[PDB]
Amino acid sequence: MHYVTPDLCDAYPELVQVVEPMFSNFGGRDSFGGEIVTIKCFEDNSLVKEQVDKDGKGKVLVVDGGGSLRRALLGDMLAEKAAKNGWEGIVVYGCIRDVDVIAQTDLGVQALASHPLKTDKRGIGDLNVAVTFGGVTFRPGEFVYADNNGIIVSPQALKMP
Template sequence: MEMGTPDICDKYRDLLQVAQPVFKSFGGLSRMSADVETLKIKHDNALFWEILKQPGHGRILVVDAEGDYCAVMGDRMADLAVKNGWKGLLIHGYIRDSALLKTMPLGIWALGTCPMKGHLTRPGHLSVPLRFAGLDIDLSNTLYIDEDGVLVSTDAFAEFAEYFP
């Protein structure tokens, strides 16, 4: 029997935050769970590029791009993420090259697509607490993401590990 985020909610309701239903899946993985790294940016994805060049160690990079309507990630960045061991990305912002992203072994959830990229003018902030879509996310969190939603918890639920590669 397949298990997912609804089953986690049924068992651990009081230990979870549930994201507002604003994220869409764009990557080749339809579900994932991992510890997080956080990044806050605005229009500028230069630091985002640098982080994806570093070993991901199977983590999920959570990026708060403040929902601005410009793409902060595309296929070349996704390729870097795969090569460097990132499991996935949760982006409070937009992506581009969506057809190519679906072919990559990477979980990618974002608000949507935009063909225009942002500017390279502002610095970002790494490993900071983030707040968006009804979530408060920091480095102590584990994310569970599938077709039904995005969950954040300070606990890792071992009995669900096999259902979230």
């Protein structure tokens, strides 16, 4: 399902909040949206590995990686796993890698930047806690929508006009 983020803002002005314009599209799907599931982590993608292995149909993985520009939290293997498991997309407050393959993966991916250095997995991270970055609080069970225009959040599921 594709989303037009200006259309959703126009239709639901009292419901939407727009994320600060700092993210870039990296995935093969330009637009994506669904129910929020969150990870809070830092330079450890243990929980990212765990979550992409779960069924993600109708869901978007929102990863608070503390905005680190020192390590990648997602690569081609995890992106492909997420795509096969039905994940609508992944938003990373942090970096990703394998951008040439992720660009060809059937998955929405928004991140701050790329970085080639992978993380040491030590099982550190919190699942489904409220996370706050880029002027927006992302809450599990609420909704996120993303395209080439930006990222938006709503407490309720939105349908395209």
